[PDB]
């Protein structure tokens, strides 16, 4: 693409610089270019990919929520007509958000997931697939909303199945997957009891395996466990 003439290693180097500079759109473009070189990604490289897009879509999601709230208020009883501009601009931001999600999903489908054989890589990418379908579901209102939700669910479920067979209950990727899938159940699938059960079971099974961990591994796992507990506190 645009990055076709730049070396893979230079794209990775520049993604790291862009991260330091908080230039996440640049970071994402560099990492897209790196993926399109066709080689598998290392652990560090997949982390750069995920950080870049998480920050780009995160900003879009926050903006969408602001605009959606304004739009909802404009449609209340007693609200003065202001014309099509709020809807148009919410639609603009939404379309940009959907485009970023489509871009990430495209990278995963061409060809990160199919070449990922190790459990850690495959689960990482399947979690991403679930996450970006979830972000599409947050803004979906038409005749494809059900199908988008089911795509998220299917990706998360495949990731869960692998993670339970192949990874310890304290593994950070496994924990973060479960955290996010639990949020999917609560916020997207209208299944708060499933959300709560998953967060609690995940937390408890991790707690029982902490004794096996080094000081540094313990720190990572406990940090994510605290996020499970925070959600449980919010929901109960």
């Amino acid at each position: 693409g645009a990055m076709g003439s730049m070396e893979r290693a230079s794209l990775i180097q520049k993604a790291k610089l862009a991260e330091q500079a908080e230039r996440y759109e640049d970071m994402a473009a560099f990492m897209k270019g790196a993926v399109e070189k066709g080689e598998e990604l290392s652990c560090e490289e997949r982390n750069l990919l995920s950080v870049a897009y998480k920050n780009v879509v995160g900003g879009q999601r926050a903006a969408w929520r602001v605009l959606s709230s304004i739009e909802q208020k404009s449609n209340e009883e007693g609200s003065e007509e202001k014309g099509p501009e709020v809807r148009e601009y919410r639609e603009k931001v939404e379309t940009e958000l959907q485009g970023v999600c489509d871009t990430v999903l495209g990278l995963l489908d061409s060809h990160l997931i199919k070449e990922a054989g190790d459990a850690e890589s495959r689960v990482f990418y399947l979690k991403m697939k679930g996450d970006y379908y979830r972000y599409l579901a947050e803004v979906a209102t038409g005749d494809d909303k059900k199908r988008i939700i089911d795509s998220a669910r299917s990706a998360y479920q495949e990731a869960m199945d692998i993670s339970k067979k192949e990874m310890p209950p304290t593994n950070p990727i496994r924990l973060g997957l479960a955290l996010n899938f639990s949020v999917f159940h609560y916020e997207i699938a209208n299944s708060p009891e499933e959300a709560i059960s998953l967060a609690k079971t995940t937390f408890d099974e991790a707690m029982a395996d902490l004794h096996t961990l080094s000081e540094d591994s313990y720190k990572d796992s406990t940090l994510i466990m605290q996020l499970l507990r925070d959600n449980l506190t919010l929901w109960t």
Binding site: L179, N180, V183, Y186, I224, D230, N231
Partner: peptide, 5 residues
């Protein structure tokens, strides 16, 4: 909003 990673 709830926590995700």
């Amino acid at each position: 909003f709830p926590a995700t990673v």
